[PDB]
C-alpha cells in the first residue's frame, strides 16, 4: 500500500499537520480504500485515523524562574550583560517620576492644599529636578507651607 494521499487528506481534514495524524498500521487495506475526504472523515470518526496531541512545551521552569526574579534573585553583576541604560532607560525613569510629580501637584492645587503661586513655584522646581520622589515633594510642601505661615505671622 501507499497511503501518502491518505495521510495528506487526513492532515487537511483534521486541520493539523501531517506530523500529527496517526494511521492505524492494522487497518492498512481499509485506509487504502479511502480515496475521498468523506471516507477520511468516516475513518476519523470511527478511530482508524486519530489526531495526535501536541508535543508539550511546559512553562513550569520559566514561571519558577520568573517568581524567583520577582522575589529578587538572579539579579547580580555576574548576571547583567547589557548596560544599565540598555536594561532600563533613564529617560523612561525620568518621564515616570516627572509625571508622578506633576500629577501630585495638580491634585493638591485642585484640592486647595496649595495656591496657584506655590503650585507654579513647585512646578518649575519639579521640572528642574528638585524633588527625588513623591515623599520628598510632599515633605517639602509641608515645610514650605510652615515657612509661609511663620512668615505671615511674623509680618502680622
Amino acid at each position: 500500500a501507499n497511503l501518502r494521499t491518505q495521510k495528506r487528506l487526513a492532515a487537511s481534514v483534521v486541520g493539523v499537520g501531517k506530523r500529527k495524524v496517526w494511521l492505524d498500521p492494522n487497518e492498512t487495506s481499509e485506509i487504502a480504500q479511502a480515496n475521498s475526504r468523506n471516507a477520511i472523515r468516516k475513518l476519523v470518526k470511527n478511530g482508524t485515523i486519530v489526531k495526535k496531541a501536541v508535543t508539550v512545551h511546559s512553562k513550569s521552569r520559566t514561571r519558577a524562574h520568573a517568581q524567583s526574579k520577582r522575589e529578587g534573585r538572579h539579579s547580580g553583576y555576574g548576571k547583567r550583560k547589557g548596560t544599565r541604560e540598555a536594561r532600563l532607560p533613564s529617560q523612561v525613569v525620568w518621564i515616570r517620576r516627572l509625571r508622578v510629580l506633576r500629577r501630585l501637584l495638580a491634585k493638591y492645587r485642585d484640592a486647595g492644599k496649595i495656591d496657584k503661586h506655590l503650585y507654579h513655584v513647585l512646578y518649575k522646581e519639579s521640572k528642574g529636578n528638585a524633588f527625588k520622589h513623591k515623599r520628598a515633594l510632599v515633605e517639602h510642601i509641608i515645610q514650605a507651607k510652615a515657612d509661609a505661615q511663620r512668615e505671615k505671622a511674623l509680618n502680622e
Binding site: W22, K52, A53, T55, V56
Partner: protein, 50 residues
C-alpha cells in the same frame, strides 16, 4: 518493585519528541485487561459475561 516501575515508565515514555497517545482514542483488549485484574486480585465473572 518501584525501581522496576521506574524502568517500565522510562521505556514507555518519551516526551522530548512526541506526546503519549490518549487512552480515550486508543482501545485495549481482554488480554490487556484480565491479566492486570488478576495481578491486582479481583473477580472476573462480570467482565467475562460482558
Amino acid at each position: 518493585r518501584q525501581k522496576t516501575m521506574i524502568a517500565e515508565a522510562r521505556n514507555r515514555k518519551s516526551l522530548k519528541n512526541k506526546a503519549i497517545m490518549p487512552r480515550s482514542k486508543l482501545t485495549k483488549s481482554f488480554g490487556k485487561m484480565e491479566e492486570h485484574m488478576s495481578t491486582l486480585g479481583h473477580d472476573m465473572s462480570a467482565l467475562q459475561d460482558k
